[PDB]
């Protein structure tokens with residue numbers, strides 16, 4: 079049965095956890111919703127809206143006042159549990175908490191972090207280069223995001239090996255452990271780091287954030303719990319997918335690989351264009367006020383799903399979106415990879431550096447890689463799309 083306020087022509091059954099063809103190609107899968115109305119109602123997953131044209135994706139994603147970030151996901155009970163700070167807050171609450179978190183991730187700090195984050199990326203590269211091949215997802219993409227985390231909070235080097243294992247269970251698969259247990263496992267992982275740094279603040283990421291006030295008052299212990307968790311998680315799944323799609327891109331365009339080994343001065347621009355090119359994040363909102371859009375109305379209560387890839391790769395919003403070209407003059411905030419509006423990734427600057435440093439180490443130190451001849455590339459769906467297997471070969 080469909081609600082009165084949803085025209086029957088807008089009804090689809092698209093399932094956002096498996097768009098069909100998602101395993102073969104994440105983006106085409108999503109891109110099929112372009113041949114249809116700009117805002118449709120999906121009967122899967124308990125019934126919700128999906129934004130399906132870039133103007134709609136972009137406009138709704140900015141409506142932070144009428145579209146709340148509180149449900150977190152379309153899966154009942156998952157928002158209630160994780161309570162991400164800032165990611166799940168509205169209005170003034172969200173303004174207060176965002177300020178010092180943001181300030182923790184300021185340019186000079188990302189910039190200061192460059193050398194250290196590169197060496198990490200390089201060390202991982204070197205542990206693989208002798209092999210002549212690798213499952214890049216499981217051996218690199220899924221492993222660098224946690225390493226960098228370790229380096230952002232500056233854990234002492236002795237501990238890093240023990241803490242990488244501890245951490246590996248929760249970067250991340252699925253995966254028959256409740257939403258509740260998951261959050262317990264990351265709080266337990268994170269807690270020790272929090273005690274040390276609310277006690278003896280250092281100059282790493284968390285200390286910096288934890289010594290700033292929140293609207294005048296000091297962080298409570300639970301808020302730091304919620305905000306740290308949020309930094310951890312916000313930094314793992316998305317970065318890996320991205321680093322993944324970038325290594326993808328290069329295995330399938332060896333000519334870029336040469337453009338880039340020849341013109342390493344071109345890496346920054348290529349990061350920005352690659353990041354516009356392969357965005358795989360999608361978010362939910364819950365309507366707190368009735369919102370008109372695309373000549374229809376979303377009602378208080380309704381859930382809304384926002385795939386960034388229907389903005390960036392909608393040819394109606396960007397010329398030849400599927401072309402990696404170097405003459406757009408597009409500022410990154412003009413596309414929706416890292417989101418839009420009040421909720422726009424605090425970690426933008428850092429991600430972009432992250433990718434750059436990967437390119438710099440991956441293209442400099444490595445020889446010419448390619449896809450393996452007899453192993454497929456496959457991706458997955460959900461909120462953070464990604465490859466689930468990326469077999470890559472090269473002459474050691």
Ligand code: HEM
Nearest residue numbers: 164165312313316317320359361415416417421423425429
């Ligand atoms: C691959 C790189 C990344 C991508 C594609 C990505 C994607 C996003 C997107 C789309 C949002 C907006 C979410 C929304 O409006 O619902 C977001 C926000 C957020 N990201 Fe990222 N992210 C990335 C990296 C990071 C990193 C490196 C960190 C921190 C270590 C991080 C921490 C956060 C947090 C806390 C927010 C919430 C901001 C708020 O509500 O004010 N992310 N990210």
Ligand SMILES: CC(=O)/C=C/C1=C(C)CCCC1(C)C
Nearest residue numbers: 150311312316360361461462
């Ligand atoms: C449910 C969960 O464990 C992950 C939640 C998320 C993160 C950290 C990144 C941005 C939004 C999203 C993709 C929902």
